Amino acid sequence: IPNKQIKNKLLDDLKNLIETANEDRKKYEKKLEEEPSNQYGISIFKEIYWVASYETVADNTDRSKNYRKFTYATLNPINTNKLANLSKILIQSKQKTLLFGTFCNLGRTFDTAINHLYPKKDALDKLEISNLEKLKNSFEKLLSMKSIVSDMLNQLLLDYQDDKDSIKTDIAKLESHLTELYKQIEKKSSQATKLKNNILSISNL
């Protein structure tokens, strides 16, 4: 009830969300630094081209390296040794450029929100209870959009291995499944853009 305790509970929660989210970032940065030659078997990177170029997302450029890093943010919880199998399923996606586009976007949107908040994680007390709450619910939701995307792609590995809905034995069903997945993830991506923006809006600091 007394506002000091409310305010401080919120500074506690933001503190913990911000460090948990920083651990995730230290982890996908490290996933890039230790990326082997074959990019964990994600051969789809080679098939994805910048806008009017022969440069792929597999090449050794800053923008290419960042695209794969943000993709590894989104895929961060999947076991590294399953990414080859994940890429084999997705190669069959009719919208893999767009799909991978959204992986990059969730990663980047995420990365921007934590890069903005990490340096301020101990000095959020200048905000007022209303828009400290909005900050916390916004960021926690952002973490959530990206987590769900990770769960969805993890689940696809098991469903495909199980032949669920005949996804393994029927290519047409695999395709519409993958298409539906891309719509789901695309919403999560749009929704993640709004929340990075909300967050940047109310935490100038």
Ligand X SMILES: N[C@@H](CCC(=O)N[C@@H](CS)C(=O)NCC(=O)O)C(=O)O
Please identify which residue in 16, 38, 97, 137 interacts with ligand X, judged by CB under 6 A. Answer: 97
Q: How many CB atoms lie within 10 A of CB 39?
A: 20
Please identify which residue in 9, 63, 126, 187 interacts with ligand X, judged by CB under 6 A. Answer: 63
| CB distance 183 to 99 below 8 Å | no
Task: Write each residue from 9 to 48 as x if it is in contact with ligand X (CB under 6 A), else as -, in one continuous string.
Answer: ---------------------------------------x
Binding segment (CB under 6 A) for ligand X, from list 19-27, 59-67, 118-126, 130-138: 59-67
User: Would you state the torsion angle of the CA atoms of residues 128, 131, 136, 141, taken in this order, to the nearest 10 degrees?
Assistant: 180
**Distance of alpha carbon 203 from alpha carbon 191, whole angstroms:** 19
| CB distance 128 to 80 below 8 Å | no
| CB distance 99 to 93 below 8 Å | yes
Task: Write each residue from 106 to 125 as x if it is in contact with ligand X (CB under 6 A), else as -, in one continuous string.
Answer: --x-----------------
CB of 106 to ligand X, least distance (A): 8
Which residues share a beta bridge with 49? 56
Binding segment (CB under 6 A) for ligand X, from list 5-13, 61-69, 113-121, 147-155: 61-69
**Distance of alpha carbon 185 from alpha carbon 188, whole angstroms:** 5
The contact set with ligand X (CB under 6 A) reads 48, 63, 66-67, 70, 97-98, 100-101, 104-105, 108
